């Protein structure tokens, strides 16, 4: 199972509002091919990991690879996410290990 761990500098509510637009702007990926979890407030553990990669996280959410045949869209999905969180910073770690985002 492949999961993008996504940390955000913005709060949970705003994060979610932003994710609605993403879901609406990329129905292809995000209805079935990738599943986007609900956003949660980052606890201490997630904040710790985000801060090792430069970022002060307030919220966190997960993106699961639901269709294995689309495993090659991870980098494009990552970019779509960086862009739909304009108003803030996002760190994306594939399986909470590999940084897919800049810096």
């Amino acid at each position: 199972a492949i999961d993008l761990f996504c940390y955000l500098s913005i709060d949970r509510g705003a994060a979610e509002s932003d994710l609605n637009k993403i879901r609406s702007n990329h129905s292809e990926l995000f209805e079935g091919k990738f599943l986007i979890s609900p956003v949660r407030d980052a606890d201490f553990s997630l904040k710790e990991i985000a801060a090792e990669h430069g970022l002060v996280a307030e919220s966190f959410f997960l993106v699961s690879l639901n269709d294995k045949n689309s495993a090659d869209l991870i980098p494009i999905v990552s970019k779509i996410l960086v862009d739909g969180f304009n108003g803030g910073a996002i760190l994306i770690l594939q399986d909470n290990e590999y940084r897919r985002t800049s810096l």
Partner: protein, 132 residues
């Protein structure tokens, strides 16, 4: 032991990281089937979700940490469960330097809500079990 269902096809354009996680998933299936489990790869199931395996009937997912940070490995599992709705996890230590022992200790001193059966495969193909 047994192995059925279609094994995972890795898309050509996938990079080294993604490619390696799919390799390890196909590999965990074979390793377990040869240890006596009945393994079905990419089983049809009800939810919107498409689990990796079915191991003696139970839906299971593969997780192949490259990190050696045992705490982080736990944090990761925990969240795969809470946000990803995973339950039973195969943890394949092929590319990790974290000991099977240390993972078991961690998962025990800090239970992880929702977590089901965990099957560890170490670098040598030895299976240990961490029960729900």
């Amino acid at each position: 032991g047994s192995l059925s269902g279609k094994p995972t096809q890795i898309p050509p354009l996938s990079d080294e990281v993604t490619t390696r996680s799919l390799i390890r998933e196909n590999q965990s299936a074979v390793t377990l089937a040869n240890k006596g489990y009945d393994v079905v790869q990419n089983p049809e199931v009800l939810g919107p979700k498409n689990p990796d395996y079915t191991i003696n009937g139970q839906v299971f997912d593969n997780y192949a940490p490259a990190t050696g940070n045992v705490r982080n490995i736990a944090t990761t599992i925990s969240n795969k469960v809470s946000s990803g709705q995973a339950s039973n996890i195969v943890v394949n230590l092929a590319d990790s330097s974290a000991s099977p022992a240390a993972i078991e200790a961690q998962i025990n001193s800090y239970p992880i809500p929702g977590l089901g059966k965990v099957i560890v495969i170490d670098k040598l193909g030895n299976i240990t079990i961490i029960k729900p």
